[PDB]
Amino acid sequence: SMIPALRELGSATPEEYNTVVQKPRQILCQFIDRILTDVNVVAVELTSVMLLDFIQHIMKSSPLMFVNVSGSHEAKGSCIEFSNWIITRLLRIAATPSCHLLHKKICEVICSLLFLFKSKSPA
Amino acid sequence: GSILINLLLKQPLIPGSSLSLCHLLSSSSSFSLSALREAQNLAFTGLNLVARNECSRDGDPAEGGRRAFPLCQLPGAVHFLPLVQFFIGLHCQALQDLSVCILEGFSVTALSILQHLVCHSGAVVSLLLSGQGQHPLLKMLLHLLAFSSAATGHLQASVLTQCLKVLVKLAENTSCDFLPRFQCVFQVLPKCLSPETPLPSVLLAVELLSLLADHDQLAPQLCSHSEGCLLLLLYMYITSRPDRVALETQWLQLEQEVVWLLAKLGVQSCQCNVEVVRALTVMLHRQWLTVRRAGGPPRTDQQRRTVRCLRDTVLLLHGLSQKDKLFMMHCVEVLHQFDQVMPGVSMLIRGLPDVTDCEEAALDDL
């Protein structure tokens, strides 16, 4: 998506920043849904692993996409819901037996996301 | 718990003093030689219930919901509480009067037994849940704790610690609505923090202050006053240590409890707000010194805990860097002492494999 537009809030106010940033967050989401929709469609064999590495690297590269530094209190309810959707996709995988061996790949992204969340604020 | 019966019948929990739990049940010597013999018979009845130990079965599977993993709710425990009332509360009267030492020993033993019961039973807490003046033994305990801090006696030092610990352990498991009761402790707790109050009582104090920040009514209480805020007495005790013994492995514990409190206040989301940051800097240095001289990691678990308080201090100063954005204005005055400690601990934290990437960005700030 527009990772560069996601990096900077710019002219958008926090509430509009919510949408501007949710868009590419939603792109990562769409990528994740098909990836973790079925453990059988994509053999875990543990590339989805490339997508997970990209998700962790993306947490590092775009903390704003993962969580707003200002926090956007009102807006974040949505950022947190989106991260929870991603983590739901991941949990479905972690629920599967074959994907249970591929757990660490599911973790990497979520753990980096938690690091980012703490970085923006400990709460 | 079956262990709760063990604890009940055990050599004096308190080190020394010749205390017999069998005297906590059967001791000739509120007074008048009536109904206290009956209290002793009641202790015997609780022992009878205790023995069978039918309650402590299969890890208390019946209880559910709040207070999850509840110490097996014990009917016998509730029974023991009354004799304890004949004990602890009597000295409280002696306290009301302008000998006492003999009473104080029995009172301390009774408080210890009460601590065990509160910790390991789901009943004596149900008594706390009852509510006011209910749970009158708590009223007696609160009176004693407030007076204990006020007067500095060899008996006063310990009693304060014990009452505080009871309050704290109970407030832990209780619900939020049930913590609106413990609210009364907040007012009396202020005296406890001051150095004049027992150091062991000040540590339990720090613990209960963390707990306060956990409570919604206790939080505002921690920073409610325009002057002081009723907090930062704790910030001041770690920085300046009023103990002749001054064992190094106590101030680290105080500051570490306080640091857990701060991280908890953060997660949960005055001039007093300002003292926590500088005190955290000071502690970051203190924990830093012990490890720096020997070099390498901790040859002590308490030393590992000092290192944990170090990492937590860097992370908490980062949160504090994000907090009151204008961190520098209040920092500058202690800024030299803090700058000495920060970057070397940055190196040390980078050295350890465990340090987190989030703790690492915190570190990055300073």
Task: Give a description of the structure.
- The structure is cut from a larger assembly and holds chains A (about 120 residues) and B (about 375 residues).
- Chain A has about 120 residues and is mainly alpha-helical.
- Chain A has helices at about 5, 15-35, 50-60, 65, 75-95, 95-100, 105-120.
- Chain A is built from seven helices and no strands.
- By secondary structure, chain B is an all-alpha fold.
- Chain B is built from 18 helices and no strands.
- Chain B has helices spanning about 1-10, 20-25, 35-50, 75-85, 90-95, 100-120, 125-130, 135-150, 155-175, 180-195, 200-215, 220, 235-240, 250-270, 270-295, 300-320, 325-350, 355-365.
- Chains A and B meet through helix 7 of A and helix 14, helix 16 and helix 18 of B.
Per DSSP E runs of 2 or more residues, the count of β-strands of chain B stands at 0
* N-end to C-end Cα span of chain A: 29 Å
Number of helices of chain B: 18
- What profile does the largest beta sheet of chain B have? none
Topology readout:
This is part of a larger assembly, with chains A (123 residues) and B (366 residues).
Chain A: H1 3-7, H2 14-36, H3 48-61, H4 63-66, H5 73-95, H6 97-101, H7 103-120
Helix pairs in contact in A: 2-5, 3-7, 5-7
Chain B: H1 2-8, H2 21-25, H3 36-52, H4 75-87, H5 90-96, H6 100-120, H7 124-129, H8 136-150, H9 154-173, H10 179-193, H11 199-214, H12 218-222, H13 233-239, H14 248-268, H15 272-294, H16 301-322, H17 327-351, H18 357-365
